[model samples]
Target: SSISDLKEVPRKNITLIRGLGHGEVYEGQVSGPLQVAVKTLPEVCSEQDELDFLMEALIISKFNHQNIVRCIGVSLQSLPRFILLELMAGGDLKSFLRETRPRPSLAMLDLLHVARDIACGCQYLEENHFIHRDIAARNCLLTCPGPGRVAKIGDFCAMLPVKWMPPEAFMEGIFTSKTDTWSFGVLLWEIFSLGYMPYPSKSNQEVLEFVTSGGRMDPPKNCPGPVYRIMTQCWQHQPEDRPNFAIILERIEYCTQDPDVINTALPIEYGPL
Candidate 1:
């Protein structure tokens, strides 16, 4: 089937939302009362860039999972391509964490729920042999505004950020579920630290050298022991040594069994407009 066969929203119908990365995202109504997010690529791009953009869209369009953001369709009738997705009212987790920081307001259960949702999404990808090269707090999106809002992995196929990338990805450009797991560990740190930078005060080169020398980011201050343990497992030097997303999900589930872990305070609610 052609990309046009899926769905095509006339450009005139889209209301510009805001700038997202190299694209301009817009708010558009779908077939229902709810609005959808329409991400439009840059008007001017190289042939290779166009290929990457469409390829990413094609792969994401096949995904079907609640924890994974849904790609409603794409617009290919014009010059700049557009991919429509489920609207995440609460926005990305990075900004959300920063906005609620200094004094946490979310319950431990809320935090665990977000983590679990990410794990579930990754597990789905792992099971399907799909590699999400980038997984971080910034790539995670909130379903709504509140502590209990559902978190879904987004930013599908976006350029990889060095900070959240695993050692193998940085060193060899080798991306696999294991690399994603390593990044997931960094994401966990971000969640616990209220979006603190991983390996703070370290350059990309510094992080590369440090991790190669068997160094890992320290646990967020006062982070639960069980959670920290999982992060360590993900940071193993050897990709084969890192636990799969399945195990990661189980470990997180196990942590939730502890009332204290699940009852911890989280950040206050805030997201994209």
Candidate 2:
């Protein structure tokens, strides 16, 4: 069983910071001052919850990708099941993007690297028969606020807000690797927009109506033409019409190589994604 291979992180060697969640997300540290974020199941969680927790850990443990979040260790011998993850020192990518606001500290190339890395992870998962189920810029984490910061795919297991979801998912209650592809387009939009909310000032109901009615978000100001085209390809109304992660990855790779694809010189309008 994959669970058997998990490391038994000891209680004695850890310290925690308070967080709010299904259980608690205690900001933690292992011995040697190694920072980790401990995602714990509630003390009175049901058997079903435990099973899901184990499965979640199993999936993360089995994955080996630079962009996918790493499962450092686990403490599941007792009631409070703790899943340890690398502490994203820079916090969620959304906050980092929003914090920078009108003036970005990192170049467009740096941000493209993040989008590329995420595509790599999604491609890995899609090929491996794994469904991330949720993919968005807010879900990605940055290593730090500086230029060298590396973005990684992390936040998992939640039905995201309507704006990030595709029609197949919300309309037919269907989800597949393609569902992730749809969300990836939204994620790219979010990143390029510097962490702007997907549908600014729109309610979930409005988004549901608008998106299902053939509405799509406009490209962020200064978003390159080629990149905007990629975004549209991901927004195909029919699930089968959408491009796979592999194709998206290749397109992004192309964008990365084309110096003229993204212009860092244009002054961007600020507010939100």
Candidate 3:
């Protein structure tokens, strides 16, 4: 049961793929035919940084869900410490929405699955007493390309998502599943809007101002009423006002089952990529 028992990939064995995340994340291989994304400590790092690195690897390893990215292993046998993860080729959801803006073929069911998947994963997190801290489209990864591609939450981190924070976050400075619920709704907005910024013109301070002052992002064009309602429920100013992930998942189930909602998937006619 030693943490050291996790599989260790020799640092030299990895053939670095193109730099992603500015060289921190890389494409590479583990077992033959099993491609992976590799993460490593910075060239300049300390024991505390290593502790954060390895502890995160431990946390990721303990997670069991399809909607969240899988951690394959950790490499602590050498100088460049590594954490290996099952590779997601379709990339993050932020650009995925914009990239497919011109395609009218995407189904609302597909996006609803994305919502259910993420929400289900979050339910797992809450049940397990873990908070993602940061939840956004950019942090979500797709299973593959095109319609029906699964959105799996990945690259978890914290305290950097001002635009995605709930109103209460600015005060208590405490994070919980409630905070994630708020951010998840924003991601729903991103998904429904085909990837628009939550508040494009607002600053971090201004975002707090806007939400605390009785404001919320408008529903994207063609956004299903039910979907928009869920977004609002998630964005309620009081942390206690937001629905739990179980309830969130249940609401999504209703939407996905509604034929009218399924057919109303937003498709862009013209837009800047």
Candidate 4:
């Protein structure tokens, strides 16, 4: 849709919202007085590659699940493949935790909520045989407006190519569904720690070495015990040993049964907010 097509909100009403990692996102008013996010890719990106990403994005948007990010529509004619997505007012788990410190307030219950959303989304992907090779806390952003809120998984740069094909993919190439599960393990840790940065003091090289060497993030100092155990299971080096999405979801849900489960969800820390 063109800027002129938005009748409710004037184009001038738009505001440039702080972007996540690489892409830029703007919260703008449509001519129709609607509020939407406009995502623009960087200049270094190629149109063909961006188009491929957008097409996969469209398929993901069509996914009918409360846990995943909702793909609104695309503004193709708009510059930089300006794609539209359901705005996550909460930004992302990573962004939020960067501001908040460690807390006991976030317990098993809170972890379950995060886990449920992930499992639901993962189950959908597994069912469709779509591998989300890049699964992490940064990718799980919160939907606008508050409590018992929804989360939308964003970004698809490292998506895998089928069950197991290229030998290079196995040892050195991109990834597969099982690889996605490996990240899911790390994500579980992130959620358990209220979005703490993985390997807080480590550099990219170090982190990569650790992971490439079959290492994973150790649970945070204050992470709930049961939850941490689950994370450990997810982080197992053997990909097959890592439980499937449904199993992961069930284990997390188990925590909900504990009457003592804490649920003091913290508000996001003020970064660029």
Per-model lDDT:
0.80, 0.83, 0.83, 0.62
Candidate 3 or 4, higher lDDT? 3
The superposed Cα distance between candidate 4 and the true structure at residue 230, in angstroms, equals: 1.6
- Tens-digit lDDT string for candidate 1 (29-91): 654254788877788878898887787678788788989999877776776778888888898
Q: 122-186 in candidate 3: lDDT tens per residue?
A: 89999998888788999999889866577888963234577788866765687887999999999
lDDT score of residue 90 within candidate 3: 90
What is candidate 1's TM-score against the reference? 0.88
lDDT of 3: 0.83
Evaluated at residue 157, the lDDT of candidate 1 is 26
Off by over 4 Å in 2: 17-22, 156-160, 266-273
RMSD of each: 4.3, 2.9, 2.4, 6.4
What are the per-residue Cα lDDT tens digits for candidate 2 across 106-163? 5678778889988988999898988777798768887777877777888742344788
Ranking 2 against 4 by lDDT, winner: 2
The TM-score-based order of candidates, best leading, equals 3, 2, 1, 4
In terms of lDDT, model 4 sits at: 0.62
- Flag the better candidate by TM-score, 2 or 3: 3
Q: How many backbone clashes does candidate 1 have?
A: 1
